[PDB]
Design a protein around this ligand. Structure first.
Ligand SMILES: Nc1ncnc2c1ncn2[C@@H]1O[C@H](COP(=O)(O)OP(=O)(O)O)[C@@H](O)[C@H]1O
Ligand SMILES: [Mg+2]
Lengths: 120, 314, 178, 227, 167, 281, 227, 411
């Protein structure tokens, strides 16, 4: 009986400007991280995965290398967002950014994604 | 460097005799074993059996020559070498959850035990009833305490919470000390005053240490960061983001350089610039302790790991 | 449990040594006197033998059991030899040749049960042990000769030889080696 | 009747051929079709000797190796052998198990000038003619397309074997009525979409892109949109 | 769509960062020691769960905690016959979760199989060889599935002849 | 077992014991035993009116009367004849043997007793086989509702007798495996040329049947055997009848045991993976 | 110290040895193949001490296990082990003679005459252990008595219709000489009864002469101390 | 339903098949399966693993005891199923060949040995529902059925529904008390002594004495002398004295036929006759680590049962399973219990000064002809009832829950 009742409880203007690396540098300006908002977090990703898919493989190396250490850590949080619901083939591109990003950031850039208490 | 394996299974914690000629280590069980430097090899000399669960912390009071041990048993015992036998002593720890860490203060009159109870228990000896009695630092703690380190003043106690934050408390027991000398971490210090608290909000803090000049602490964090915070500046923290795996243990080795170890299983080294406050990485498992020279100028240190055994360095 | 423990320990009997010294009925000579009743410790060990060897556990209920377990081991050693005998006549003399052999006395090393028997402290027990344990063996052999050899052909009788493979709680009076 | 001699005979003969150099046109007076038909019956029913079930693997290995130096779809005395046989139930089965694991049984020795991968070569001949294409049971034909479309999408670019599997698919679509049943088509279209767009420079990939283009322009059902 | 070698390499590195366990006596029961990923009674001991995915069908979830990590996998069911073969393959394997010491006796809903790695395993077994096992599992499982499909064809093809031939 | 033996083994064993013991001259003892069979045909062996000296066997076919329309009684009059008796009330057909009049060797008599199921079905098949010799095809389809859910149709076409089983695969796991088996049957004609041709339809009844409003469902298969004259002639017919009448349970029996074959190999492949993990210790 | 354990544990695996279940034979063979090698590749001082280790329990295990196992494929390996073990030390011989091993060999040889390959070793081992001529338990004459001797006198005269190598006549002479060696005087001798009880004493009667002129004897192959 | 349910009882020695409602099992067969064998074609590359349809060439029962070219396996040991691959092949051929049952249309009653682990109840349920699509299964406690077989057989004036049953089949002996139709699960005891270990003891006891027995047939002759000549004796050491003095006549002769040569062989049968059955009374003869006589294990059971039922339990002890058939086995157990019980009352007389004499407990041990199949016959009389069809698990319940519907057990 008794024991049953529990108790105890702007980006487009840089992209079409050709030097689209300047767009990605701009895409990192909109983190929702500190906010309590949730619809904005769905907007934040869509503004970046549209960018990630645009790169030629001739550039995806420098597009990582031109980031600062925060930039790589920032990027990895966007990478692990696209994997949560892939596009019809875009996983083929995220896994290619991941290759470059992990080369720059090392596994340490993953760990402060796993431990990130507030996120984009 | 040199290496030796005492056992296959994790050496959860270690302590050293004053003249380093003996070590105490826990063989992943409810005991602690003491070894002597009988040649290059180690010989086991004494075996402290009294605990009723896995122990998780030791400190061997250098001058007093008495050992404190605690663990999941909740019990802590201070061990007196009563002739050819170590005899325990009761500590009335009021903690309701597992103990996690212990260190003696530099004056060896008090020690503190961290625990999952979301408290630090400071201890001192009653002479009239033969037990050690506790007072709790309790107010802004909100998760288990993982590591302790004692300021040179034997009053300030830095404590690594599993709360993403490193905190410094005045453990001033008036029954044991005159009111403590003034210090850059702040002149106002009754018992349990909150001297400092980290700015960040992510990653558990595994280790904290005070420099031999108390004005710099550094702490080591599961987000793969080492931070150092400076009381000659206005408590200003500086953080190094790194591409290592998490680091588990840290200690100073000079007044401006620092050493850590962790899940990469190798030592790594940092320097602190007094001008910009920038750390830098010099590079190369679960504890580091300086063997000779203290934190003022280390010349050897020891590391023990879950992978087993200890290493000694240069 | 219900193994057959020694019956004869009437308190009026003398109790010299770590074992019941008992009045071995024989024409041999020794420290023990002559029983006159039809039942005796050697006859008891013989009688219960076929049952006792199957019980894989055995207490010492009283001092007489530390005798009986030794008589049983020697009886086994008899079979370990008589089985080879070509006829009953050899089965007697080749048994006497066994009785006067230097068996480990319980306090001597190489005896299998040194945990269970205290050391004989002095000559007037030790020499009594030599003069008693032979008087056991000398008699014990002559009793088996009469009944292991069934009278039709002086074959060593099959039923007895079956027990050659079985040892009382797997202990051997060969000790660590003969 | 000598089981052990027979076993070593097949093994050593495969070893001898395993490097893949052309014999003078005279050995075929024996090692031509009359021999190949005999090997098939040793796989399809064997001999009462073979209580170790050991002759099948040896003769299957021999048939693959023996194919390794044969030029063309009509001269191939071995592909003729299958065509004239009654039915190849067991050989059909065993061969796909090799393609599934991807290994090559014939490379028993390790000398440097590695020949073409013997099984991928063997299948490319088998589908060289519609008469020899019929050998597979229909349920194996489906499994073959599933096996080859797993491989084509697993390998990295620049890997030496991708220019083989692309050729096998092209054959399957040619001489086997693939477009009737489209077994993996809404998957393969999405694969050809990306390999056709794959931006790499190495000759291996350049060769890959050419056959992928040809694979589309030969049959416009491929490379068109999934639907 | 995504090729094998880049996808596997990403999963390896992530799992290597999650396998950073330590022993931890629980806060909410007097001295029980239990894997935080399962009991979830504390909620500051949990790491942010992350998914790696090759396409919409094939993905891995990595879900860590200060003392335990859970890994759950989904594999491409390429046709109807393969769904049945796969599910039964897991069950006969999962039925030995006392020998595959890292294996849960039940999968997570919507996942095909899932491993729970505790600090005791990473202390008692070589970490890089457990990860190699999880990687090897993905390198093989769709070969091990297809091989049964080839054999199930063969069994039926024999059974048909064994019936029809006797007419 | 690859094939399924047609004799009911319990009937053989009970009667063999009774007739051996009786011919050995022992006084008889009672028997009072009831036992099922495929298709839910339910036997009873009993002593009539308590005569321990008489033994009786009865069949209870759920679908007797509709089969009986095709003359089953004039078959039983042939193969059993004087061993027939009135139906044991509750059962369709009954057979009686006297322990007093057992002949000098019994084996064929007890074997004929064992087939008392098959001997019913033979009456519908021996009909349409024979009509093919008569060259008629105007006679209507036979129908046997050999289960509740399942029906067998027979037509004599001018060249070909065709038997068309309708059967229900009771599970998603069964129908997916059945779709493999029947696919191999369709190709069996390649492996052994002389066999009858087989056809399969994944769900719908085949067109030639559709005037009958044959049952439709995701679990329903339709399976046709086309028996050519080499299978229906007077020499072969007994062998063909022993096979076709079992076919439904032969297919299901292998669908079931195909699982056991898979389960065995999954345990083997598990043991392979386990040896790989064991290198982590 | 491992192999003797893993055998002695299958002895008194009371369930498995009478009501079998697992595929035991394929692993037991691996132990015996290894043991047969080490019983000769090791220093004899090691293997002697492992035999006499604990009142010969190591030996009595294998001797019991030979009686317990009916598979002919293994028995050959146990006999080969007894071969080496007999060579190490006469003390081991003094155990085996007094033990059950001779009597099972006596029954196997009379019953399993078809197993010619094992039958040759069966004769050889029985000849080895008897070579020292110690006294034998009187129970043994229930088999190794006169009937078994007449059974030997048959083989040396007639051979066997199955005897491909015809070796057994010679090994039976050795065995007859070996069994005879321990027999007391000339009255009761079980072999001398057999010789007196048949007229079938021709080739044997002559073959003894070819030894006598050879001057040596085949027994005492080991040359242990009390020759 | 119209078609009768199947009752399949599987033991470690025998299995017992038939449809419910019959008075008697329609097959009694040994629990053995003879799988196909190879000349080391199975090896370290792969052990006992088949291909194609090679797995279906096997037999079970007496069709598998005497085939030369097959390896005999015994899947059930200590009552527990040890190798489910062989057991599933065994079940298939039971259903589709021996019983002729279609599993999809007959309810199954199937037996639990009271020791078995819950995992084995999952796996046995996985067979019937997921391998065979049985419409409903019930797992019955073997001892309660044995009591029901006594209940319906014995006179209506003493159909007590209360008694202790001793079920010494092969495998393990269960001693189980039932009071007024409820199993007292707390008091159940298991004794490891059983028909296999009595066989093995006799087999060793012969092989030490009576070599000449051919190794292929040692087990057969050990079983024969156990069945035909063995008896529970009155006093252990007094028999040994009788066998020595009257060895002309207590000794017996068994003649066997050589399976290979067809020569006869003879053995003298002797101390084997009373050793063996007395292993129930001296379990340390056969096991290192069990020692309480069966006559003192059964006392502890009743003395743990509620105080009111104790006396009735003594009044009605039922013997079940084949090993309980030994001559005098009832007489001795009744004598030992009676000698224990009335001595216990002698104490409570003295602690009350003889002031009152307690009504002495009568003890009864009951032998009845069903003993060779009382478990199946009980099962048949249960599975006949219309009640039985509602206690069974309907197949849908196996769909909605997992196989866990058989985790529960009444112990
Ligand atoms: N005449 C007999 N006397 C004693 N025991 C017997 C006799 N006949 C058979 N047995 C024993 O009965 C057993 C029969 O199987 P049983 O124990 O009834 O079923 P289960 O296999 O379920 O235990 C045989 O193994 C044998 O041990
Ligand atoms: Mg039973």
């Amino acid at each position: 009986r008794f024991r049953k009742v529990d108790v105890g409880e702007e980006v487009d203007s840089c992209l079409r400007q050709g030097n689209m690396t300047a767009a990605l540098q701009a895409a990192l300006k909109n983190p929702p991280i500190n906010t309590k908002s949730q619809a904005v977090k769905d907007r934040a990703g869509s503004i970046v995965l549209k960018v990630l898919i645009s790169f030629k493989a001739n550039d995806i190396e420098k597009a990582v290398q031109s980031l600062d250490k925060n930039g790589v850590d920032l990027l990895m949080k966007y990478i692990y967002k696209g994997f949560e619901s892939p596009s019809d083939n875009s996983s083929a591109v995220l896994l290619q950014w991941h290759e470059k990003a992990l080369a720059a950031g090392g596994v340490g850039s993953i760990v402060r994604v796993l431990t990130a208490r507030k996120t984009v | 460097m040199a290496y030796h394996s005492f056992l296959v299974e994790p050496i959860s914690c270690h302590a050293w005799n004053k003249d380093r000629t003996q070590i105490a280590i826990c063989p992943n069980n409810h005991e602690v074993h003491i070894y002597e430097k009988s040649g290059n090899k180690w010989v086991q000399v004494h075996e402290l059996k009294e605990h009723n669960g896995q122990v998780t912390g030791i400190d061997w009071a250098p001058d007093s020559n008495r050992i404190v041990t605690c663990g999941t048993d909740r019990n802590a015992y201070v061990w007196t070498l009563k002739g050819r036998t170590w005899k325990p002593t009761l500590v009335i720890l009021r903690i309701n959850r597992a103990a996690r860490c212990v260190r003696w203060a530099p004056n060896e009159k008090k020690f503190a035990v961290g625990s999952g109870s979301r408290v630090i228990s400071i201890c001192y000896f009653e002479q009239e009833n033969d037990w050690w009695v506790c007072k709790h630092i309790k107010k802004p703690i909100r998760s288990t305490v993982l590591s302790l380190d004692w300021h040179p003043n034997s009053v300030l106690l830095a404590a690594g919470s599993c709360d993403f934050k490193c905190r410094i408390f005045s453990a001033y027991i008036k029954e044991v000390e005159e009111r403590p000398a003034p210090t850059p971490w702040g002149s106002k210090m009754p018992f349990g005053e909150l001297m400092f608290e980290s700015s960040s909000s992510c990653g558990w803090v595994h280790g904290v240490c005070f420099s031999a000049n108390g004005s710099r602490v550094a702490w080591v964090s599961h987000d793969s960061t080492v931070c150092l915070a400076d009381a000659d500046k206005k408590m200003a923290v500086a953080t190094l983001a790194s591409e290592t795996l998490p680091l588990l243990a840290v200690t100073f080795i000079t007044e401006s350089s620092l050493v850590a170890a962790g899940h990469d299983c190798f030592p790594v080294l940092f320097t602190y610039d007094s001008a910009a406050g920038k750390l830098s990485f010099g590079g190369r498992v679960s504890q580091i302790s300086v063997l000779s020279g203290g934190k003022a100028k280390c010349s050897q240190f020891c590391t023990t790991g879950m992978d087993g055994g200890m290493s000694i360095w240069d | 449990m219900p193994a057959y423990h020694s019956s004869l320990m009437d308190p009026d009997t003398k109790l010299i040594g770590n074992m019941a010294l008992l009045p071995i009925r024989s024409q041999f000579k020794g420290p023990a006197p002559r029983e006159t009743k039809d039942t005796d410790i050697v006859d008891e060990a013989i009688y219960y033998f076929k049952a006792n060897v199957f019980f894989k556990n055995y207490e010492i209920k009283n001092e007489a059991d530390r005798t009986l377990i030794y008589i049983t081991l020697y009886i086994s050693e008899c079979l370990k030899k008589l089985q080879k005998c070509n006829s009953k006549s050899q089965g007697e003399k080749e048994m006497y040749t066994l009785g006067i052999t230097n068996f480990p006395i319980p306090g001597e090393p190489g005896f299998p049960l040194n945990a269970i028997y205290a050391k004989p402290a002095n000559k007037q027990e030790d020499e009594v042990m030599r003069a008693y344990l032979q008087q056991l063996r000398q008699e014990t052999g002559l009793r088996l000769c009469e009944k292991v050899f069934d009278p039709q052909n002086d074959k060593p009788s099959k039923w007895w030889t079956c027990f050659v493979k079985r040892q009382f709680m797997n202990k051997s009076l060969s000790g660590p080696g003969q | 009747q000598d089981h052990q001699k027979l076993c070593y005979s097949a093994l050593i003969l495969a070893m001898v051929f395993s490097m893949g150099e052309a014999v003078p046109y005279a050995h075929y007076e024996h090692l031509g079709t009359p021999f190949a038909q005999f090997l098939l019956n040793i796989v399809e029913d064997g001999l009462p000797l073979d209580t170790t079930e050991q002759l099948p693997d040896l003769c299957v290995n021999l048939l693959l190796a023996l194919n390794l130096h044969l030029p063309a779809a009509d001269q191939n005395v071995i592909m003729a052998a299958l065509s004239k046989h009654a039915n190849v139930k067991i050989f059909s089965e065993k061969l796909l198990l090799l393609l599934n694991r991807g290994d090559d049984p014939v490379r028993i020795f390790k000398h440097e000038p590695q020949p073409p991968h013997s099984v991928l070569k063997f299948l490319q001949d088998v589908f060289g003619s519609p008469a020899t294409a019929a050998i597979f049971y229909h349920t194996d034909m489906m499994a073959l397309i599933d096996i080859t479309v797993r491989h084509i999408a697993d390998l990295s670019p620049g890997d030496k074997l991708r220019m083989e599997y692309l050729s096998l698919m092209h054959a399957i679509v040619r001489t086997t009525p693939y477009l009737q049943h489209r077994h993996r088509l809404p998957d393969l279209q999405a694969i050809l979409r990306r390999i056709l767009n794959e931006e790499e420079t190495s000759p291996q990939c350049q060769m890959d892109r050419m056959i992928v283009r040809e694979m589309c322009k030969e049959f416009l059902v491929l490379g068109e949109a999934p639907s | 769509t995504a090729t094998l070698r880049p996808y596997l390499s990403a999963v390896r590195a992530t799992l290597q960062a999650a396998l950073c366990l330590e022993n931890f006596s629980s806060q909410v029961v007097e001295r029980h020691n239990k894997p935080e990923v399962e009991v979830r009674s504390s909620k500051e001991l949990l790491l942010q769960p992350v998914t790696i995915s090759r396409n919409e069908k094939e993905k891995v979830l990595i879900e860590g905690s200060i003392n335990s990590v859970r890994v759950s996998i989904a594999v491409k069911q390429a046709d109807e016959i393969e769904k049945i073969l796969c599910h039964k393959f897991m069950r006969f394997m999962m039925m030995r979760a006392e020998n595959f010491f890292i294996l849960r006796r039940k999968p997570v809903e919507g996942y095909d199989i899932s491993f729970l790695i505790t600090n005791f395993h990473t202390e008692q077994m070589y970490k890089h060889k457990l990860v190699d096992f999880v990687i090897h599992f993905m390198e093989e499982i769709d070969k091990e599935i297809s091989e049964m499909k080839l054999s199930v064809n063969a069994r039926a093809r024999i059974v048909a002849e064994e019936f029809l031939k006797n007419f | 077992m690859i094939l399924l033996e047609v004799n009911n083994r319990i009937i053989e064993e009970t009667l063999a014991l009774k007739f051996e013991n009786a011919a050995a001259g022992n006084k008889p003892e009672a028997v009072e035993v009831t036992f099922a069979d495929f298709d839910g045909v339910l036997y009873h062996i009993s002593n009539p009116n308590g005569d321990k000296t008489k033994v009786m066997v009865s069949i209870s076919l759920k679908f007797y009367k509709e089969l009986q329309a095709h003359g089953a009684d004039e078959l039983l009059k042939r193969v059993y004849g004087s061993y027939l008796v009135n139906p044991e009330s509750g059962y369709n057909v009954s057979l009686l043997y006297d322990l007093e009049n057992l002949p000098a060797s019994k084996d064929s008599i007890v074997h004929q007793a064992g087939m008392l199921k098959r001997n019913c079905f033979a009456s519908v098949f021996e009909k349409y086989f024979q009509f093919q010799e008569e060259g008629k095809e105007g006679e209507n389809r036979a129908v046997i509702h050999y289960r509740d859910d399942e029906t067998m149709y027979v037509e004599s076409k001018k060249d070909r007798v065709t038997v068309v089983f309708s059967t229900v695969f009771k599970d998603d796991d069964d129908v997916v495996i059945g779709k493999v088996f029947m696919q191999e049957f369709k190709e069996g004609r390649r492996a052994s040329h002389t066999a009858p041709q087989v056809l399969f339809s994944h769900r719908e009844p085949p067109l030639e049947l559709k005037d009958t409003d044959a049952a439709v469902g995701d679990n329903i298969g339709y399976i046709t055997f086309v028996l050519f004259p080499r299978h229906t002639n007077a020499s072969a017919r007994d062998n063909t009848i022993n096979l076709i009448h079992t076919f439904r349970d032969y297919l299901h029996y292998h669908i079931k045991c195909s699982k056991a074959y898979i389960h065995t190999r999954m345990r083997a492949k598990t043991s392979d993976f386990l040896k790989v993990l064991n290198r982590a210790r | 110290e491992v192999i003797f354990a893993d055998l002695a544990r299958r002895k008194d695996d009371a369930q498995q040895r009478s009501w079998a279940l697992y595929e035991d034979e394929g692993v037991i063979r691996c132990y015996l193949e290894e043991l047969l090698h080490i019983l000769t590749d090791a220093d004899p001082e090691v293997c002697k001490k492992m035999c006499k280790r604990n009142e010969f329990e190591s030996v009595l295990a294998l001797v019991a296990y030979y009686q317990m196992e009916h598979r002919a494929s293994l028995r050959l390996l146990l006999l080969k082990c007894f071969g080496a073990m007999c060579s190490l030390d006469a003390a081991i011989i003094s155990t085996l003679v007094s033990s059950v091993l001779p009597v099972e060999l006596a029954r196997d040889m009379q019953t399993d005459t078809q197993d010619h390959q094992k039958l040759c070793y069966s004769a050889l081992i029985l000849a080895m252990v008897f070579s020292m001529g110690e006294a034998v338990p009187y129970a043994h004459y229930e088999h190794l008595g006169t009937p078994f001797a007449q059974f030997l006198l048959n083989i040396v005269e007639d051979g066997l219709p199955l005897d491909t190598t015809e070796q057994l006549p010679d090994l039976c002479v050795n065995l007859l000489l070996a069994l005879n060696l321990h027999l007391p005087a000339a009255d009761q001798n079980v072999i001398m009864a057999a010789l007196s009880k048949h007229a079938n004493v021709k080739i044997f009667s002559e073959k003894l002469l070819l030894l006598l002129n050879r001057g040596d004897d085949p027994v005492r192959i080991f040359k242990h101390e009390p020759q | 339903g119209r078609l009768p349910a199947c009752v399949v009882d599987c033991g470690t020695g025998y299995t017992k098949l038939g449809y419910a409602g019959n008075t008697e099992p329609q097959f009694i067969i040994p629990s053995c399966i003879a799988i196909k064998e190879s000349a080391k074609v199975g090896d370290q590359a792969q052990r006992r693993v088949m291909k194609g349809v090679d797995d279906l060439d096997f037999f079970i029962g007496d069709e598998a005891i005497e085939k030369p070219t097959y390896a005999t396996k015994w899947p059930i040991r200590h009552g527990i199923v040890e190798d489910w691959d062989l057991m599933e092949r065994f079940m298939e051929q039971v259903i589709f060949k021996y019983l002729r049952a279609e599993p999809e249309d007959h309810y199954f009653l199937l037996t639990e040995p009271p020791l078995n682990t819950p995992e084995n109840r999952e796996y046995t349920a996985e067979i019937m529902f997921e391998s065979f699509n049985v419409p409903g299964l019930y797992i019955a406690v073997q001892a309660v059925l044995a009591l029901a077989a006594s209940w319906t057989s014995r006179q209506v004036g003493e159909r007590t529904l209360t008694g202790t049953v001793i079920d010494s089949g092969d495998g393990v002996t269960h001693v189980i008390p039932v009071a007024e139709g409820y199993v007292i699960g707390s008091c159940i005891k298991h004794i490891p002594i059983a028909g296999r270990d009595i066989t093995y003891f006799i087999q060793q006891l012969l092989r030490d004495r009576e070599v000449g027995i051919p190794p292929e047939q040692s087990l057969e002759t050990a079983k024969a002398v156990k069945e035909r000549y063995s008896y529970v004796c009155p006093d252990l050491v007094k028999e040994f004295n009788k066998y020595d003095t009257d060895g002309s006549k207590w000794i017996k002769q068994y003649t066997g036929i050589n399976a290979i040569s067809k020569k006869e062989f003879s053995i003298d049968v002797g101390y084997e006759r009373f050793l063996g059955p007395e292993i129930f009374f001296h379990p340390e003869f056969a096991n290192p680590d069990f020692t309480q006589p069966i006559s003192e294990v059964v006392d502890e059971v009743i003395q743990n049962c509620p105080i009111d039922v104790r006396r009735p339990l003594y009044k009605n002890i039922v013997l079940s399973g084949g090993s309980t058939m030994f001559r005098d086995f009832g007489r001795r157990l009744q004598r030992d219990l009676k000698r224990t019980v009335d001595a216990r009352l002698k104490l409570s007389e003295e602690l009350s000064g003889g002031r009152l004499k307690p009504k002495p407990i009568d003890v009864q041990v009951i032998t009845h002809h069903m003993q060779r199949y009382a478990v199946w016959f009980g099962g048949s009389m249960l599975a006949s009832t219309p009640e039985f069809y509602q206690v069974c698990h309907t197949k849908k319940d196996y769909e909605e829950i997992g196989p866990s519907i058989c985790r529960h057990n009444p112990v």
